[PDB]
Amino acid sequence: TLKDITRRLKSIKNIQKITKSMKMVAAAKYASEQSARMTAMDNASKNASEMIDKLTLTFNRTRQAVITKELIEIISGAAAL
Amino acid sequence: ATGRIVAVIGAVVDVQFDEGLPPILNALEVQGRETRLVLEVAQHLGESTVRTIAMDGTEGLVRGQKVLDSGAPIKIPVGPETLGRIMNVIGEPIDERGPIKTKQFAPIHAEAPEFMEMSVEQEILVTGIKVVDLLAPYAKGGKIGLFGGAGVGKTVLIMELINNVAKAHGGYSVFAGVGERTREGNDLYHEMIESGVINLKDATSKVALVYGQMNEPPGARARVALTGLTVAEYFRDQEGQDVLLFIDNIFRFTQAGSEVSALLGRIPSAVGYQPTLATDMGTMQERITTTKKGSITSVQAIYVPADDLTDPAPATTFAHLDATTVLSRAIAELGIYPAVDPLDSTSRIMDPNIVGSEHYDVARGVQKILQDYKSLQDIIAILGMDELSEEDKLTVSRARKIQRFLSQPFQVAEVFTGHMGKLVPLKETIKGFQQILAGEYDHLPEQAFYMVGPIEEAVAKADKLA
Amino acid sequence: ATGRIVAVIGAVVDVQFDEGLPPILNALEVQGRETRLVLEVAQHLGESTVRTIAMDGTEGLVRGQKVLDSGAPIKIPVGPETLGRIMNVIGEPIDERGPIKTKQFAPIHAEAPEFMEMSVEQEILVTGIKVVDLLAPYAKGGKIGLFGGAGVGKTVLIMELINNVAKAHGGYSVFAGVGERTREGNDLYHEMIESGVINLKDATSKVALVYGQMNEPPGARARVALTGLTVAEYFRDQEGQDVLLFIDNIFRFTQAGSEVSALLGRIPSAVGYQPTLATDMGTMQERITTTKKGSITSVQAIYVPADDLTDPAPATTFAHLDATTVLSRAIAELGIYPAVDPLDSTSRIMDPNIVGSEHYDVARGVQKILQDYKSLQDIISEEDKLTVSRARKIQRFLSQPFQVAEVFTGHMGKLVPLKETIKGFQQILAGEYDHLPEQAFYMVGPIEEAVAKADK
Amino acid sequence: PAPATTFAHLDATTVLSRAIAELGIYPAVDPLDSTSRIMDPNIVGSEHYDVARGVQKILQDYKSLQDIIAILGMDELSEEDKLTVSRARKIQRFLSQPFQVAEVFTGHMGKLVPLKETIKGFQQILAGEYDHLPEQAFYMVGPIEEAVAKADKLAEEH
Amino acid sequence: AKLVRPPVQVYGIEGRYATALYSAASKQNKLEQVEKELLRVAQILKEPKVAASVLNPYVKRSIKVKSLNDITAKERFSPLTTNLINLLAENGRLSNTQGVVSAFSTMMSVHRGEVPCTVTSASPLEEATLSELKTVLKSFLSQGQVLKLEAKTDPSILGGMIVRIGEKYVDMSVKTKIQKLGRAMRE
Amino acid sequence: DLEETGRVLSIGDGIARVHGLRNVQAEEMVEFSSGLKGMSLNLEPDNVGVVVFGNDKLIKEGDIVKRTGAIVDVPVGEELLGRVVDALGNAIDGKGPIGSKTRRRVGLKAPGIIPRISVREPMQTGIKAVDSLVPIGRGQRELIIGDRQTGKTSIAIDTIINQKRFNDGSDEKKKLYCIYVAIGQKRSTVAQLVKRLTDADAMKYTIVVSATASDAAPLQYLAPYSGCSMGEYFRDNGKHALIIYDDLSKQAVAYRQMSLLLRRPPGREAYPGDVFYLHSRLLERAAKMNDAFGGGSLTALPVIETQAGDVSAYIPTNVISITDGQIFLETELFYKGIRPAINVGLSVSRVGSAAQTRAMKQVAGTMKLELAQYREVADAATQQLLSRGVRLTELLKQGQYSPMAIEEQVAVIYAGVRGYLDKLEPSKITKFENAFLSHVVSQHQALLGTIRADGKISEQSDAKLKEIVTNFLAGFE
Amino acid sequence: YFRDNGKHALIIYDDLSKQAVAYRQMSLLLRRPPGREAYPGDVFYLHSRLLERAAKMNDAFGGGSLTALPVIETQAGDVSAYIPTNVISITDGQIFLETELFYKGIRPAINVGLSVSRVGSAAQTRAM
Amino acid sequence: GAGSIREAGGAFGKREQAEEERYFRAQSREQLAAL
Ligand SMILES: Nc1ncnc2c1ncn2[C@@H]1O[C@H](COP(=O)(O)OP(=O)(O)OP(=O)(O)O)[C@@H](O)[C@H]1O
Ligand SMILES: Nc1ncnc2c1ncn2[C@@H]1O[C@H](COP(=O)(O)OP(=O)(O)O)[C@@H](O)[C@H]1O
Numbered sequence A: 001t002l003k004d005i006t007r008r009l010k011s012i013k014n015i016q017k018i019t020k021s022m023k024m025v026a027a028a029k030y031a032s033e034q035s036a037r038m039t040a041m042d043n044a045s046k047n048a049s050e051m052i053d054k055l056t057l058t059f060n061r062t063r064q065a066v067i068t069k070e071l072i073e074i075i076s077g078a079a080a081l
Numbered sequence B: 001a002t003g004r005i006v007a008v009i010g011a012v013v014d015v016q017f018d019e020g021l022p023p024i025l026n027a028l029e030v031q032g033r034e035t036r037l038v039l040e041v042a043q044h045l046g047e048s049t050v051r052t053i054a055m056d057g058t059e060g061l062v063r064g065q066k067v068l069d070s071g072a073p074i075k076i077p078v079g080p081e082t083l084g085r086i087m088n089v090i091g092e093p094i095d096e097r098g099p100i101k102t103k104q105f106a107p108i109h110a111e112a113p114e115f116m117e118m119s120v121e122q123e124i125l126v127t128g129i130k131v132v133d134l135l136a137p138y139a140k141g142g143k144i145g146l147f148g149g150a151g152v153g154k155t156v157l158i159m160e161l162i163n164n165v166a167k168a169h170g171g172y173s174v175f176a177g178v179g180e181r182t183r184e185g186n187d188l189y190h191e192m193i194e195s196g197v198i199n200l201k202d203a204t205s206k207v208a209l210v211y212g213q214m215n216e217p218p219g220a221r222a223r224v225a226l227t228g229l230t231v232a233e234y235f236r237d238q239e240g241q242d243v244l245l246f247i248d249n250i251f252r253f254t255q256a257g258s259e260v261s262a263l264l265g266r267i268p269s270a271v272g273y274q275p276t277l278a279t280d281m282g283t284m285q286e287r288i289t290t291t292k293k294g295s296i297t298s299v300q301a302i303y304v305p306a307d308d309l310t311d312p313a314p315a316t317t318f319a320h321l322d323a324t325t326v327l328s329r330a331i332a333e334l335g336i337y338p339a340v341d342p343l344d345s346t347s348r349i350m351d352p353n354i355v356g357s358e359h360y361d362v363a364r365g366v367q368k369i370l371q372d373y374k375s376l377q378d379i380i381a382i383l384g385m386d387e388l389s390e391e392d393k394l395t396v397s398r399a400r401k402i403q404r405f406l407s408q409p410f411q412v413a414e415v416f417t418g419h420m421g422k423l424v425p426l427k428e429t430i431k432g433f434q435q436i437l438a439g440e441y442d443h444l445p446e447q448a449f450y451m452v453g454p455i456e457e458a459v460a461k462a463d464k465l466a
Numbered sequence C: 001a002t003g004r005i006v007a008v009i010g011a012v013v014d015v016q017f018d019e020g021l022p023p024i025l026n027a028l029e030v031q032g033r034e035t036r037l038v039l040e041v042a043q044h045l046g047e048s049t050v051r052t053i054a055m056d057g058t059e060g061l062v063r064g065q066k067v068l069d070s071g072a073p074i075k076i077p078v079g080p081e082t083l084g085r086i087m088n089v090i091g092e093p094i095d096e097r098g099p100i101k102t103k104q105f106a107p108i109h110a111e112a113p114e115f116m117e118m119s120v121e122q123e124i125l126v127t128g129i130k131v132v133d134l135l136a137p138y139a140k141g142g143k144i145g146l147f148g149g150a151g152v153g154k155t156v157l158i159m160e161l162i163n164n165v166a167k168a169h170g171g172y173s174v175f176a177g178v179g180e181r182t183r184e185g186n187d188l189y190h191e192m193i194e195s196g197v198i199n200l201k202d203a204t205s206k207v208a209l210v211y212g213q214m215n216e217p218p219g220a221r222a223r224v225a226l227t228g229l230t231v232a233e234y235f236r237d238q239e240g241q242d243v244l245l246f247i248d249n250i251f252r253f254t255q256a257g258s259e260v261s262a263l264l265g266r267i268p269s270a271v272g273y274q275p276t277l278a279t280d281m282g283t284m285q286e287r288i289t290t291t292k293k294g295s296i297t298s299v300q301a302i303y304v305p306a307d308d309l310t311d312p313a314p315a316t317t318f319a320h321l322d323a324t325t326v327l328s329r330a331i332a333e334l335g336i337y338p339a340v341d342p343l344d345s346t347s348r349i350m351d352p353n354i355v356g357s358e359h360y361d362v363a364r365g366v367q368k369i370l371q372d373y374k375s376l377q378d379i380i381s382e383e384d385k386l387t388v389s390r391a392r393k394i395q396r397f398l399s400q401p402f403q404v405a406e407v408f409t410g411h412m413g414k415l416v417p418l419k420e421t422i423k424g425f426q427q428i429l430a431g432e433y434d435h436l437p438e439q440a441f442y443m444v445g446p447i448e449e450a451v452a453k454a455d456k
Numbered sequence D: 001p002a003p004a005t006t007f008a009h010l011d012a013t014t015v016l017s018r019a020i021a022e023l024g025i026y027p028a029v030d031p032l033d034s035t036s037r038i039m040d041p042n043i044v045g046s047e048h049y050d051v052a053r054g055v056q057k058i059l060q061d062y063k064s065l066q067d068i069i070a071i072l073g074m075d076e077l078s079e080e081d082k083l084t085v086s087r088a089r090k091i092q093r094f095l096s097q098p099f100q101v102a103e104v105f106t107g108h109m110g111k112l113v114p115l116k117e118t119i120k121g122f123q124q125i126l127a128g129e130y131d132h133l134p135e136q137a138f139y140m141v142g143p144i145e146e147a148v149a150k151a152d153k154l155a156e157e158h
Numbered sequence E: 001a002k003l004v005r006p007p008v009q010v011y012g013i014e015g016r017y018a019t020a021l022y023s024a025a026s027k028q029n030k031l032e033q034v035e036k037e038l039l040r041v042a043q044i045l046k047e048p049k050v051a052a053s054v055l056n057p058y059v060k061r062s063i064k065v066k067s068l069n070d071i072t073a074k075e076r077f078s079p080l081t082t083n084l085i086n087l088l089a090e091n092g093r094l095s096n097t098q099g100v101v102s103a104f105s106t107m108m109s110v111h112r113g114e115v116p117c118t119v120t121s122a123s124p125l126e127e128a129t130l131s132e133l134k135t136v137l138k139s140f141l142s143q144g145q146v147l148k149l150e151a152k153t154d155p156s157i158l159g160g161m162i163v164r165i166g167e168k169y170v171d172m173s174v175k176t177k178i179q180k181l182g183r184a185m186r187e
Numbered sequence F: 001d002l003e004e005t006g007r008v009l010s011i012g013d014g015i016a017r018v019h020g021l022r023n024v025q026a027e028e029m030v031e032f033s034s035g036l037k038g039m040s041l042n043l044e045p046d047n048v049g050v051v052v053f054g055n056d057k058l059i060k061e062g063d064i065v066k067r068t069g070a071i072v073d074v075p076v077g078e079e080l081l082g083r084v085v086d087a088l089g090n091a092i093d094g095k096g097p098i099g100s101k102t103r104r105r106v107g108l109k110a111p112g113i114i115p116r117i118s119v120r121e122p123m124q125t126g127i128k129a130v131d132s133l134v135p136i137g138r139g140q141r142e143l144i145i146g147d148r149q150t151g152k153t154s155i156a157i158d159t160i161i162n163q164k165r166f167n168d169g170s171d172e173k174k175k176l177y178c179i180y181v182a183i184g185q186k187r188s189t190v191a192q193l194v195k196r197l198t199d200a201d202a203m204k205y206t207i208v209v210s211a212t213a214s215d216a217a218p219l220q221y222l223a224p225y226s227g228c229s230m231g232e233y234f235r236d237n238g239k240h241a242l243i244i245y246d247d248l249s250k251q252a253v254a255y256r257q258m259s260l261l262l263r264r265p266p267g268r269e270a271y272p273g274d275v276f277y278l279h280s281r282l283l284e285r286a287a288k289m290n291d292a293f294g295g296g297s298l299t300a301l302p303v304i305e306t307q308a309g310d311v312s313a314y315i316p317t318n319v320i321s322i323t324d325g326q327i328f329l330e331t332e333l334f335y336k337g338i339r340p341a342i343n344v345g346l347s348v349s350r351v352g353s354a355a356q357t358r359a360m361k362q363v364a365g366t367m368k369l370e371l372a373q374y375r376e377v378a379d380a381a382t383q384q385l386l387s388r389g390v391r392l393t394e395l396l397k398q399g400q401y402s403p404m405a406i407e408e409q410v411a412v413i414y415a416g417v418r419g420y421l422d423k424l425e426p427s428k429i430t431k432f433e434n435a436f437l438s439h440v441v442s443q444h445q446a447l448l449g450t451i452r453a454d455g456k457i458s459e460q461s462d463a464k465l466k467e468i469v470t471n472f473l474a475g476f477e
Numbered sequence G: 001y002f003r004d005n006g007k008h009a010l011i012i013y014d015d016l017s018k019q020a021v022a023y024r025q026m027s028l029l030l031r032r033p034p035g036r037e038a039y040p041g042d043v044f045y046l047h048s049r050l051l052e053r054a055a056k057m058n059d060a061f062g063g064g065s066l067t068a069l070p071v072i073e074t075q076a077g078d079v080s081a082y083i084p085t086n087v088i089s090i091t092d093g094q095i096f097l098e099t100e101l102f103y104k105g106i107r108p109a110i111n112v113g114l115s116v117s118r119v120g121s122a123a124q125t126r127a128m
Numbered sequence H: 001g002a003g004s005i006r007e008a009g010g011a012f013g014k015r016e017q018a019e020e021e022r023y024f025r026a027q028s029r030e031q032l033a034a035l
């Protein structure tokens, strides 16, 4: 569903930004637990951007399919006249 | 009754009869052809014109060509003489072993059994596959459907079911290849000969074969499932036998309907499908049934277009099945084979009064822990494994062990893996999953459960790894 | 032959001919109009009627109005007298400088060159621009997708390509403004006049402009690319030149084809484009190629709808592109001109079998050092600082001053040869200039200029 | 197209949300999606307008902080931000109201809050005058005196 | 094969068959004869037994075209009319026949230059003013046309007369006059 | 004469409505006065719908259409070898007419069940990754699927070039005649490909059927079936042909255009309902025939282009459900420098494993197992698995336009899987490989020749290989 | 009229989404072939020939001008809809408004990251 | 996308809701007992 995918994309882009900022804060405070937090939030941001890329591919596929399905409905309704 | 062709459009042929218009579903023979070209009447268009679907290619058909009415629908030979033989959509032998010398012929169009002819018995059908036996067990006399996208393992699974169930079967068996690979039919034929199930020297064969494969025009692909049904219905009604009916692929039936629906002049439905999709599917599927005159166990492979499980054809097939095995590409790419989705496969004998409370509770617990792992997937995926409770970590560990243990090496899949195929009894399956659930193997590495048979092979593999 | 208008539905006109129907793609002149209205035949409907798409507005047309068959497709004036002019899709001057006085006309509908007229070997079109020639060179006869729009110097790059090809290779340029905004068309005309590419006084103009504006019906915007391509085809086949053809925008060419196909009543394909999307694009793009006489190289501004690269229009265009040049704003903010992103610009001929082992090795080294530099920028050891230094120098050295900008910046314009480019980046990579300061490589030509600037 | 076309024919849209009804807040009016053409300081007075805009702003800030709460949890928030979240949850509950027609759905009695009482109560929550009272004291009450009485009772029980 | 198109156009099945027959008849200079034959064949068509046999949908087209064939041979028609009727019977457009007929009729309605023009009045006006308008109107015509007047009387116009000369249309009625004055009064 | 002649009623949308031709057959080639040809698609009670094999610009209403009396067929024979023809079998390379005395219908049905036998003979591509991990047999249909510019055509061209060692030999049962069908590609690309094959001396046994991006959609829809008939001429006469369809995504697009212009109901992604049948009836004709039918074969290599690597789309899935396995080419591996960019974990060959030579099995079972373990891993045992997997991955890379004999692939994979490369650092594996091969080619032709003759590595030959690899790895950097 | 007579006009179309909807109604009822979102093939032509009439004349034509401020309502912020895509393609820039910025207290709720003016500083006084 | 994580549902929106409810039931307990 396009709306499901848009909600999930928004949620995960937000998670990505939050983990990125937490990583920057940890890399500031790193000047053993702080380095661990820095790497943990870095890996979290990497995984979030990975999921964002996959979900963007899915989103584009789904919106193209929705446009085509609506066109086909309109064309089929018009050809019945 | 002699008519003449007035229009040819692909697989659809309009025939004009001056005297004696033939009923719908009749077979008409085109005159002046080297091979037999049969047209099935689909519509009366008025003005003494009928619209028909061709069972072969319509190249070389001319306007004005004569057409004779046979007086009855397509009639195929039915009887014990069809065993060990290969016939096409119209019942011709396509194995070059000469004519099929049965005593009776049946029309491939018949009414489904009545409501008072139904049977309610529900014995279990043990296959030797752990995931099917545990989570979605098949039933004797039931309807089994194997869903799956392209290249996820429908044919490997149907050939494993032929290996496990059809080999040791007591009764007869019919295999209908509907819109599949012709080299797969050649493979199956020669594999059934070299296994002795088809005997080219006497009358000891136990399997009939019907084939209209993906090279055939849409009319043949639309009627070949009906031909296989007709053979199985003879073996059920007229001999009381217990029949196995393997169809691969049943989706192609529906698909072929689409291809002619355009040319038959019908307003399309959703996804460009025939407006008659559910009624056509039901008219076909209600004949594939058990009556109180005989049992038919049906295994149908169902192609899922573009892995879309809500496509009209699989979504409409779902309601016709007693047990469904839904293969997943995501599960296949993890290396788990068969790629059965444990949280998407169901069965109607998964009821404690039928499988016993032990089997029922083990299956339910496995599905619960897999669903819990699936719930945790998001947190695991972003924040990693370190942010879970020790209870969440324990459930993830057990769920991944259960995941790998659901995989299994098949005897028909050795040739492209080398690993010997394992056939696990039902009690062994219940026992092994019960033990993984109770916590008796929380020390073994999760790769020790991958591609083994019973739980003892898991312990042996875990030993060998260390 | 003379027919009469029998139907006017929007920009679609049905014309009935009592004798001698015109072939499909023929041009028909509607008679009795204040301005010239041309119809392009698209179908034969039967009953001596043809359906046509109009090249202008159809207001005030009357059923029964006479229409004249011209006996050919749309014909435009081709020749040197088209250089420095502006014409529309039907070959009319729209710059108010009088008639375009050529000796030869050419139909805008022609077939791609035969299989035996193709050049069997790929070769590089040298532009004299360092980043282009090195990292993502242009194939002689290829299609180049220019990404990046406003605020990155796309027009300065276009004019510099026109000037560099005219100076180095002796070939002219055509600029097809498909779906061109009239404001930006006027702006570009005057930018080209000031930078010297167009010259309104003598015969030394280097580019021919063909405009089809946004306020024109879909048929006009669909055929304006073929009009520009016909001018370019004259310059290639009759003059034996190495022509440039700029197409801005190519997505608008696709959209005009979509609108035309929807007006003609055709069932739309997937997403919504015309069912003939690939063959429209193909019959246009196959004419831009190297024959045995000359070549046409085409730089085509690409727009990606919804930033989805799998959209049918970009995905059908990308099948034809031989190179990609990405103008980035992050590179322009760094003062580097041209703003060509050095890591995102790609080329299919960047292959040791086409460009040579040395060119390919230099380009791969430059690319790896720039990747390494951004990798190090991520966290900000021993030689990490040396890669940082050499990558800063490489970045600065990709910049270059353009001739068409001399009246603004004052600096002189550099057309770097290809050998000089390879050698300069080779030497910077081998460490031969680790003593010069990094600001000595900014806005110079060859590497000799970098050492002479560090002498200061 | 039907609701989207209707929107331009109205003077004061009230948009009910399912995300709000599942919190238990009734009526499920979406505060950040409802609109009125008389929500103008020159019409409703600057006090009414300022209170309304402050409520909407603190609810939008609560939205923006909930992502941070999802990742970093609640204990790692600023003190100003914990205060924002507290006042925002209190304002959410206080927008709820028991209806006379929903007496069967809730068992509660109907309350009809006057205008100045509404402005005053929300101004007092935004000012911090009720930081010490729990948040379940504002759920399904009328005027703010009822929120105070409910807090006193909820304490006197436990 | 270049057509002889009629002066006025009719569209649809009626128009296509009428245009085909007009073109066929103008090549052989047999227009008046074909006209008289279509008048007669249409009045034959309206025969109740014949209408019942020709509109019948379950009668095979073979027997029906043979019936039309022999019942045209009983009339001794031109080859053009015979072939027209067989073409209509063979295509199954016999139901449109009279329409086709009238189409051809109305085609030649303008071939004789007969210009149709109806004069609506309030109450039936007498013949003196009628010949007056005869003469003053045939001034409205080009080379060689003759009037076809149909004096209609609807008093709801309560005065003046509305004259429709072909497609020209003059409104001398008093209702439009007074409404125009009233609109000038209010606007 | 309205029985062998018609007059175009209407033209436009690529389809000509023709009046007459009362004797024309369904799917028969007709010919227009303008020299163009067409296929009688829809016979209707009043008209014929004709699919034009060319531009509509050439046909006007009223134009006369004669009928050829022949269902659509192309010339076949060995007179096509070395020629570049269009979708109808007309030469486009300027070397005169094709001297073919045999024609064959493009729409013939595939051989049924009985005429076939299981695929047994190897079809040598010359690519290490393919021949070791994704082996192809003669009679198979192997899909080459991937994004744009990931190396698909390069795999096909290397196969065609590789068949030169066999087509020069004296063993006729080992020769392979190649057909390359270009469908919707650039014409310059096809000219460069023909030159690349002429340089490699590979055109003398290659037919190139070209329906490019500027050709009408019916020609691009027809080109695969013309090429398939040209290859069936060999399959049915005891010889062995290979055929590449480059690519079927563009044929599917051309067929969708033809269907939408005929106003047929669109389905998923506006494709017709019978876009599966379009490809299934074509790829079923690639078969291995048993010895009662000659024993010849026709191997198919359909190419499919995905968008953003999505292989769960409509046409990719269709062709995956038709063919006998796939070779997934990944963009991530192509950009990282791994070339061929074969995804060895997703690439499969269902029926080709029984066709691999014995020596290649001897080394490739181990190679497959070790690369699998390396995929599962990414201590001192897992670091050994990482080292071995990295070495094998570097060993599977290969240059372009240089395919290898099977014995040389065996030798190199041997050196890799037996462990001789484990102390070389990975960035030198490639270098070593070339060096090693050069040595084994110059000083040790007899070991290669005997491994070629046996088809297996004898323990004598295994000892020779061990000696040679140890002695070479010694005096190496 | 003002643009031609040396004077300067500004025009605000509030809004062009509704004009597109009206034109689509007329077209669908006239049985013209529908396209994406049932809009006719020449809805781009509609808005483009409306909007190219906003020009700046040179002094040889009086120096007058017409500035167009078309308004477009997007649904859920979807600027990839058909009519928003068309009018964003036609115009010289956009002022994008956000509802989140509106309720954050940022009013006028202009999104500065997304807004653009391709004229830019050439339309500013030197002080600004 | 200010409340995108909890308007999406799922683990990151349900865990957020649980965390908020935990904290504020704690605070409502330590606020009622101090009354
Ligand atoms: N094994 C290889 N080694 C080095 N370079 C290679 C290799 N294979 C391909 N390439 C390079 O990748 C380039 C593009 O690959 P190629 O054209 O063969 O594949 P493709 O997928 O068919 O591309 P297209 O989208 O144009 O059809 C080739 O020109 C070649 O330079
Ligand atoms: N049980 C299995 N074990 C190992 N590999 C399998 C198994 N099932 C499927 N596969 C792999 O997936 C491929 C597809 O098998 P197949 O059943 O023919 O696909 P489809 O679902 O289209 O019928 C097989 O060739 C095999 O490589």
Ligand SMILES: [Mg+2]
Residues within 6 Å of the ligand: B154, B155, B180, B248
């Ligand atoms: Mg299968």
Ligand SMILES: [Mg+2]
Residues within 6 Å of the ligand: F152, F153, F246
């Ligand atoms: Mg290619």
